[PDB]
Scaffold this motif. Structure first.
Motif, PDB file in Angstrom:
ATOM      1  N   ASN B   1       2.755 -22.438   8.269  1.00 20.08           N
ATOM      2  CA  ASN B   1       2.521 -23.585   7.398  1.00 20.08           C
ATOM      3  C   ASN B   1       2.665 -23.203   5.931  1.00 20.08           C
ATOM      4  OD1 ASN B   1       2.042 -24.944   9.751  1.00 20.08           O
ATOM      5  ND2 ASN B   1      -0.174 -25.134   9.460  1.00 20.08           N
ATOM      6  N   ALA B   2       2.202 -22.009   5.555  1.00 16.00           N
ATOM      7  CA  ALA B   2       2.353 -21.570   4.170  1.00 16.00           C
ATOM      8  C   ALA B   2       3.824 -21.387   3.802  1.00 16.00           C
ATOM      9  CB  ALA B   2       1.575 -20.276   3.944  1.00 16.00           C
ATOM     10  N   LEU B   3       4.603 -20.778   4.699  1.00 18.19           N
ATOM     11  CA  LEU B   3       6.033 -20.628   4.450  1.00 18.19           C
ATOM     12  C   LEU B   3       6.728 -21.979   4.359  1.00 18.19           C
ATOM     13  CD1 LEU B   3       6.773 -17.602   6.777  1.00 18.19           C
ATOM     14  CD2 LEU B   3       6.624 -17.608   4.309  1.00 18.19           C
ATOM     15  N   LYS B   4       6.343 -22.928   5.214  1.00 18.09           N
ATOM     16  CA  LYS B   4       6.935 -24.261   5.164  1.00 18.09           C
ATOM     17  C   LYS B   4       6.589 -24.970   3.859  1.00 18.09           C
ATOM     18  CE  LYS B   4       6.525 -28.769   7.381  1.00 18.09           C
ATOM     19  NZ  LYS B   4       6.518 -29.191   5.955  1.00 18.09           N
ATOM     20  N   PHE B   7       8.725 -23.529   1.169  1.00 18.52           N
ATOM     21  CA  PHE B   7      10.068 -24.077   1.343  1.00 18.52           C
ATOM     22  C   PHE B   7      10.178 -25.474   0.744  1.00 18.52           C
ATOM     23  CE2 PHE B   7      13.938 -23.303   3.934  1.00 18.52           C
ATOM     24  CZ  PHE B   7      14.576 -24.497   3.681  1.00 18.52           C
ATOM     25  N   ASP B   8       9.209 -26.341   1.041  1.00 10.65           N
ATOM     26  CA  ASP B   8       9.251 -27.699   0.508  1.00 10.65           C
ATOM     27  C   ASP B   8       9.159 -27.699  -1.013  1.00 10.65           C
ATOM     28  OD1 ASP B   8       9.242 -28.223   3.186  1.00 10.65           O
ATOM     29  OD2 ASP B   8       7.195 -29.012   3.248  1.00 10.65           O
ATOM     30  N   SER B   9       8.291 -26.850  -1.569  1.00 11.53           N
ATOM     31  CA  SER B   9       8.143 -26.801  -3.021  1.00 11.53           C
ATOM     32  C   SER B   9       9.426 -26.326  -3.694  1.00 11.53           C
ATOM     33  CB  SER B   9       6.972 -25.899  -3.399  1.00 11.53           C
ATOM     34  OG  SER B   9       6.748 -25.931  -4.797  1.00 11.53           O
ATOM     35  N   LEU B  10      10.076 -25.301  -3.135  1.00 14.19           N
ATOM     36  CA  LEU B  10      11.330 -24.833  -3.719  1.00 14.19           C
ATOM     37  C   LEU B  10      12.440 -25.869  -3.584  1.00 14.19           C
ATOM     38  CD1 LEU B  10      11.256 -21.150  -2.401  1.00 14.19           C
ATOM     39  CD2 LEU B  10      10.562 -21.960  -4.650  1.00 14.19           C
ATOM     40  N   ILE B  14      14.471 -27.430  -6.741  1.00 14.68           N
ATOM     41  CA  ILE B  14      15.924 -27.539  -6.878  1.00 14.68           C
ATOM     42  C   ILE B  14      16.333 -28.958  -7.230  1.00 14.68           C
ATOM     43  CG2 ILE B  14      18.114 -27.482  -5.641  1.00 14.68           C
ATOM     44  CD1 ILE B  14      16.846 -25.139  -4.043  1.00 14.68           C
ATOM     45  N   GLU B  15      15.744 -29.952  -6.565  1.00 15.63           N
ATOM     46  CA  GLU B  15      16.118 -31.327  -6.884  1.00 15.63           C
ATOM     47  C   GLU B  15      15.827 -31.639  -8.348  1.00 15.63           C
ATOM     48  OE1 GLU B  15      17.792 -33.353  -5.040  1.00 15.63           O
ATOM     49  OE2 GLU B  15      17.742 -35.034  -6.443  1.00 15.63           O
ATOM     50  N   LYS B  16      14.674 -31.193  -8.843  1.00  8.62           N
ATOM     51  CA  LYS B  16      14.332 -31.431 -10.242  1.00  8.62           C
ATOM     52  C   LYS B  16      15.274 -30.691 -11.188  1.00  8.62           C
ATOM     53  CE  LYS B  16      10.453 -31.322 -13.441  1.00  8.62           C
ATOM     54  NZ  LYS B  16      11.112 -30.481 -14.473  1.00  8.62           N
TER      55      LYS B  16
END
Lengths: 54, 54
Positions: B1-4, B7-10, B14-16
């Motif tokens: 869950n921490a890795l996921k 992943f979502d934050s990165l 990138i989108e920002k």
């Protein structure tokens, strides 16, 4: 009398010279402004400009 | 869950970062336009640069 009448001819030629001189001065002004307008059209042709610059 | 979560934050970062890539209201990397054209002569000849969406 024929020889003395040439004064009016010379006066008219001088007046025509003055008229053309005024015309050439105005033409120089117009050519400078046309060059500036060319540069404005060239600058505005770029598609990367934002709305305000255009 | 921490890795996921990382992943979502990165992904969001990138989108920002892709969103903020602009220079005076235009961008060649965010996909806002298909291509940008720049002057190449006094005649108005272009310098086509196809946009590369990132």
């Amino acid at each position: 009398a024929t020889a003395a009448s040439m004064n009016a001819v010379k006066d008219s030629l001088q007046r025509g010279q003055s008229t053309i001189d005024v015309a050439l001065a105005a033409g120089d002004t117009i050519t400078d402004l046309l060059g500036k307008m060319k540069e404005k059209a060239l600058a505005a042709s770029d598609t990367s400009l934002n709305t305000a610059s255009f | 869950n921490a890795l996921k979560s990382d992943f979502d934050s990165l992904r969001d970062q990138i989108e920002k970062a892709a969103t903020n890539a602009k220079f005076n209201g235009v961008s060649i990397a965010d996909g806002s336009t298909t291509k940008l054209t720049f002057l190449a002569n006094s005649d108005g000849s272009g310098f086509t640069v196809n946009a590369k969406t990132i």
